[PDB]
Ligand binder design. Structure first.
Ligand code: NI
Ligand code: NI
Ligand code: NI
Ligand code: NI
Ligand code: NI
Ligand code: NI
Ligand code: NI
Ligand code: NI
Lengths: 120, 120, 120, 120
DNA sequence: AACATGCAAGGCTAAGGTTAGCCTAACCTTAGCCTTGCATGTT
DNA sequence: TTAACATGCAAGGCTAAGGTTAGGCTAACCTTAGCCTTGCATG
């Protein structure tokens, strides 16, 4: 719905946290994604069950090999979308990332590869 | 979501059905979106509740002004999307409808306008 | 529903038909279990899918070994119920079969054996 | 079919819950009949629709006259079955409640009465 | 005396629904529960 | 004339508990409509 796909926006949010140094904590995801505290815990749990993440003893989020995989793919697509929007389509900059947060969840690998060549 | 957005695809199915000049019946949506007979009626219901369609006395689906407005909208983005993918991106033509059936539900109005221009 | 357990009541009706040497046909089950002809064919279909029956070239029902097994167990419990109600409980003789038509479907094998000692 | 009769088992659960002094909450039915949260809400609603219960303002389940009448009946046949099984049929005392949990939904008043008499 | 049509059962299938039951993924609110870091007035 | 001092307690981060919507599904049933293959009964 809002997130088009939750697991992906959760995986991306975690990855983005690690990227900026911040400890990947559920409380963070909650605030970053505008969702309630127990909602996040529940979903993360669901994801842990699905073998995407793991909660550590220090309560930090640890992505599994499969987790990262999916994570870097959404990140990838996010950029690739953001580019296509700003250049080829030429959408208002202040609206770009907003658009890409959605397209990122519905862009196939096929197009992904295709698009990397196209942009250039 | 398999349909990304269920309501937009139920509307597009009705509209397209109408173009083909085939009475729009739930059993028809059923075949096309591959869902159980019960699931379709249950959904058309929520839909009729939010006033997007009306189930006639002869069981045909009648889109309300709102329903028709959205339908055209979705339908319009579908084409602009199918286009964007073939013209500038260049993706295997055989995989273009499917991709566009996903993009149709995440494309913003602004991106719809900026796209009618860019493409020539 | 009314039949408590359709598959069981179908298997028994077939077996009973065979017992009285009458071609076991769907139109025959419809007659006895008082259900619409399309309903009967659909259900039998499901049963065939479940490896309980097979519909021959002449369109007669043919219980598979797993099917006859089920069939005899139902039939067997039906008798043990009809007896328990008449001998021990002493329920009105007319109302006896109707009651047993239900208990037949909800009596464990466990209880079956026991009742075969007590009852006689 | 897992409950044999879904409505009769909801009443009984509400009823038994009241005997134990536990507030009859939908969540309680879920725990006990082991069903999904959303499944219990539907079923109760359907029940409320046919006026067998009323969801209080503090969310408690209020059995209506009709509902309680049924409840008791069920509750009554449960015990009669439980005895009949353990007293004249002599079945594993351990496996008696379960067996009774099924018989309760298929026992006639006609038989209920005959049973109270034929058990000294 | 053998023919013919003349179809009507009888037995299904094709279509399109409906109810009752059940389920998961996501979200929410309202209540506590542990740690921690320390402000604050105290010896 | 301030180091030295528990320790008082609100954040911060969760879990607990009970729901809700949206979206899906299967088993069982129904009515209508149409199709096909014989068992006769009338010219
Ligand atoms: Ni970005
Ligand atoms: Ni996103
Ligand atoms: Ni198309
Ligand atoms: Ni679509
Ligand atoms: Ni009998
Ligand atoms: Ni029966
Ligand atoms: Ni008991
Ligand atoms: Ni029961």
């Amino acid at each position: 719905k809002d997130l088009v796909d939750t697991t992906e926006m959760y995986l991306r949010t975690i990855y983005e946290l690690e990227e900026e140094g911040v400890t990947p904590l559920r409380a963070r995801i909650a605030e970053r994604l505008e969702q309630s505290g127990p909602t996040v815990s529940q979903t993360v749990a669901r994801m842990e069950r699905d073998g995407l993440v793991v909660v550590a003893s220090d309560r930090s989020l640890q992505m599994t090999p499969t987790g990262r995989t999916l994570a870097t793919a959404v990140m990838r697509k996010h950029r690739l979308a953001e580019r296509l929007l700003t250049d080829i389509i030429g959408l208002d900059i202040n609206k770009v990332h907003d658009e890409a947060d959605r397209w990122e969840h519905v862009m196939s690998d096929e197009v992904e590869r295709r698009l990397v060549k196209v942009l250039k």
